[PDB]
């Protein structure tokens, strides 16, 4: 699928890179460390943990056949943050800014 491969390349080379270099992205660059953060319930409440490194590795290993599968993982990462945390939390403020950037860059993904 040439079109799907081109869209996945855009997600890897543009969207992922733009989120990664954003100054708020660091908490999302590795899976949540429930021990370090003292969150003994995180991996019970969050049923599909997700982070930018997991997405990066999936792109690198050709894990996705379609762009929608990769977009789903970005959406899960943000959704998880909002499910576990509370309005007004530092991480929720960071996530909202990152998600705005995500939507902007995603809207420029080639459509055909
Ligand atoms: C592997 C390292 O990991 C962490 C380290 C540190 C840390 O002290 N360093 C790191 C940043 C350093 N600077 C800051 C930027 N500077 C411009 C350059 C260098 C200085 C000190 C803090 C949190 C970490 N890890 C985490 N990973 C997921 C989450 C997460 N923290 N946050 C916090 C991130 C900050 C707001 C809250 C959560 C906390 C509680 C519950 C959930 C979540 C949550 O949802 N996420 C996604
Ligand atoms: C912030 C802007 O907002 C969007 C706008 C437009 C748009 O109108 N055009 C038409 C005009 C195009 N220009 C404008 C400048 N110029 C002068 C030349 C013409 C730009 C694109 C499309 C998607 C948007 N924003 C979005 N935000 C989250 C999602 C999202 N689209 N997609 C789509 C983006 C990639 C494929 C699907 C979703 C769609 C349905 C269900 C879920 C999701 C989903 O998961 N996400 C995360």
Q: Which 3 state secondary structure label does DSSP give 64?
A: coil
Atom of ligand 2 minimally distant from the CA of 100: 1
Best CA proximity match to 81, nearest among 40, 48, 38: 48
Q: How was this structure determined?
A: X-ray
- Resolution in angstroms comes to 1.5
Q: CA 37, 77, 4 angle in degrees (round to 5)?
A: 150
Q: Residue 13 has what DSSP assignment?
A: I
Domains of the chain, by residue range, sit at: 1-109
Distances (CA, A) of 62 to 13, 45, 89: 14, 29, 35
Atom 10 (ligand 2) nearest CA: 107
Give CA–CA dist 99/19, Å, rounded. 9
* Beta carbons of 28 and 36 less than 8 angstroms apart: no
Give CA–CA dist 74/95, Å, rounded. 11
Judged by its nearest atom, the ligand closest to the C-alpha of residue 100 is: 2
Handedness of CA 43, 45, 50, 52 (dihedral sign): negative
What residues form the annotated binding site?
85
Atom 26 (ligand 1) nearest CA: 27
The pair of structure tokens assigned to 103 is: 């939507």
Q: DSSP assignment of 32-84, as one string? A: --TTTTT-TTHHHH-SS---HHHHHHHHHTT--SSHHHHHHHHHHHHHHHHHH
């Amino acid at each position: 699928g040439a079109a799907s491969t081109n869209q996945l390349q855009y997600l890897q080379k543009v969207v992922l890179k733009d989120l990664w270099k954003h100054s708020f992205s660091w908490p999302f660059q590795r899976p949540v460390d429930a021990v370090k953060l003292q969150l003994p319930d995180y991996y019970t409440i969050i049923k599909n943990p997700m982070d930018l490194n997991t997405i990066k590795k999936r792109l690198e290993n050709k894990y996705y056949a379609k762009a929608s599968e990769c977009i789903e993982d970005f959406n899960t990462m943000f959704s998880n943050c909002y499910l576990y945390n509370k309005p007004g939390d530092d991480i929720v403020l960071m996530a909202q800014a990152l998600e705005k950037l995500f939507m902007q860059k995603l809207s420029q993904m080639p459509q055909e």
